[PDB]
């Protein structure tokens, strides 16, 4: 990893991140067959089997009753698109003809591919353990509607198999049919690994995905299709990672403030977030929740990206002279703050605040001068601002300083723009 400190703009650029970009969705329909539980009745009063059975009928009945700020512009659009796309696909799946075809498709196997009337191909998987048990056991065990049988093993068995079903219904009921994530009950580890293996991607992408099975779950979601007879039908949208290992970097910045004649000329780069090159194009991810790190890998959702011109990288090289409209924000008010980076931290220390760096072994080592200072995780273990202590990162990597005259020193002494927002570097000067 390489972190470069930019004295010119009081910002840092960290390179060497790899890209794991979600390019599509793989629709998987699951049919959890509950069986003919409706005809089971308990006439011998309260019993252990009756308690789970009544809960099961209750769960089934309950389910029948359910069926130009870049970051502010883009945040949730990918999420809304993901849900909307799933809902669009769900409406296609809701057709009785498709449910009938899928049920017929799964009549002879536990996994089959069916083409919906809307033309989308979906992978269908059958879950049969519960229907088998109940029919071949519980149903029979329940003789002449008597449920208080002495065979406690039967009751324990039933409570064990229904655990998954009750959890699935609970998650959808508590989430009003749209869950935020794929729990182990919606798709087990074995089911996920099998589903991934059938994805239309290269062997290399599949391998990367198989190693990070846990990350795949967090970006997916489940949607309840409905209740058709004795089978509960739901759909799971799995993320398709069609682009992997592409150069990504993250830009972080802190307020660059210069003080002339007691006055303050501050400047803050708002072009912060993740940027990745893809097929020579630069994709910008402005929302916090759309990119997540795992070591050198940053998982970003392509549906959250906004394509930016390649020239946007010039803002990290010569923002002062470049013709590219590097958008920043300014304000005659100084803000002292710590911006933690992967390989260090930006420490903006101005008038009125006491700033020092320290280590767990030596405590306070030295006071920091006023202005924007970059501290490597080798020079100190912790940074302290007044009484606020910030713990430094222990990631290993290379640190470089790109010297340059601060842009804030190139403000207009005659007149400084006041509290600028959603503007550009030229507007500040």
């Amino acid at each position, epitope marked *: 990893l390489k972190e470069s400190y930019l004295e010119e703009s009081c910002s840092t650029i960290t390179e060497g991140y790899l890209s794991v970009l979600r390019t599509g969705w793989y629709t998987n329909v699951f049919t959890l067959e509950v069986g003919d539980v409706e005809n089971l009745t308990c006439a011998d009063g309260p019993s252990l089997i009756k308690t789970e059975l009544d809960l099961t009928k209750s769960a089934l009945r309950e389910l029948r009753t359910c069926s130009f700020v870049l970051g502010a512009i883009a945040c949730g659009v990918a999420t809304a698109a993901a849900v909307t796309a799933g809902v669009a696909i769900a409406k296609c799946i809701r057709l009785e003809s498709e449910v009938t075809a899928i049920k017929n498709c799964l009549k002879k196997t536990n996994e*089959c591919v069916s083409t919906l009337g809307c033309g989308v191909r979906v992978l269908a998987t059958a879950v049969r353990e519960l229907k088998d048990f109940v029919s071949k056991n519980l149903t029979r065990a329940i003789n002449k509607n008597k449920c208080d049988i002495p065979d406690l093993k039967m009751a324990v068995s039933f409570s064990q198999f229904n655990r998954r079903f009750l959890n699935v219904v609970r998650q959808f009921s508590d989430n009003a049919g749209i869950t935020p994530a794929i729990s182990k009950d919606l798709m087990t580890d074995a089911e996920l690994a099998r589903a991934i293996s059938n994805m239309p991607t290269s062997a290399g992408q599949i391998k990367l995905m198989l190693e990070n099975r846990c990350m795949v779950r967090r970006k997916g979601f489940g949607i309840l299709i409905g209740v058709y007879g004795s089978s509960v039908i739901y759909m799971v949208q799995l993320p398709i990672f069609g682009v992997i290992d592409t150069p990504c970097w993250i830009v972080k910045a802190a307020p660059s403030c210069s003080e002339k004649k007691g006055n303050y000329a501050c400047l803050l780069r708002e072009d912060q977030g993740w940027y990745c090159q893809n097929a020579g194009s630069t994709v910008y991810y402005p929302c916090e929740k759309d990119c997540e790190t795992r070591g050198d890998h940053v998982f970003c959702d392509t549906a959250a990206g906004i394509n930016v011109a390649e020239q946007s990288k010039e803002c990290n090289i010569n923002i002062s002279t470049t013709n590219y409209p590097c958008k920043v924000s300014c304000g005659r008010h100084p803000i002292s703050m710590v911006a933690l980076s992967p390989l260090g931290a930006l420490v903006a220390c101005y008038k009125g605040v006491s700033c020092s760096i320290g280590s767990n072994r030596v405590g306070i080592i030295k006071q920091l001068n006023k202005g924007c200072s970059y501290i490597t995780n080798q020079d100190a273990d912790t940074v302290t601002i007044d009484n606020t202590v910030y713990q430094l990162s222990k990631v290993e990597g290379e640190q470089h300083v790109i010297k340059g005259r601060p842009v804030s020193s190139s403000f207009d002494p005659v007149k400084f723009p006041q509290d600028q927002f959603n503007v550009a570097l030229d507007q500040c000067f």
Partner: antibody
Amino acid sequence: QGQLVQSGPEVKKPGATVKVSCRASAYPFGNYGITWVRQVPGQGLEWVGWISAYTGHTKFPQNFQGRVTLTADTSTSTGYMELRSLTSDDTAVYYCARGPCCSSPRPYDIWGQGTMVTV
Amino acid sequence: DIQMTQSPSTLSASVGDRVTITCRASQSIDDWLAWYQHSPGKAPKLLIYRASRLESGVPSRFSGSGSGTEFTLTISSLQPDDFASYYCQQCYTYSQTFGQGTRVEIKR
């Protein structure tokens, strides 16, 4: 109902390589897989191999591992089976059948008319 | 792999006779057994799937039963067109091992 049309009988000399065709019809080929089964004269049914027409993944039994190459053209809905290092004892009827799309096993519901391969 | 043993290997019967064919799995395969009809010189025909479900277009005289490791194919009344070799197949493991087959011959 879908239909399968296999190539005609072929007679080849020992050690040659033979390529057998399997044309699918009347069904959505791209949603299934093709399994190959042979019947040696006087012997039972033996699995030869399987290919997913959706993913292209292949699996083979130990006696056919490395010897058989399977291909599935989804554009023409035609499968081909190529058997290498033919021996006189490999003279048998090779059948292509509609196998599972994926790892879940299933019965074979569509069968070709069969191809007599003579070594 | 699961070895599949059919019994008997050959059975001679007359038209209308009740025919019974057994298939044994070396380990439990639940209900994942399939049955195929293979007439000489004709392609194999699927008869039963999931141990007991009758295939579309198969005459109702054919019935399948059993579970776990032992499965049985029963023909309620053998017709002239039923004299053929029958093969059971387990649909539980990836290898889908076939049985050695049972030949149904006309009783002299």
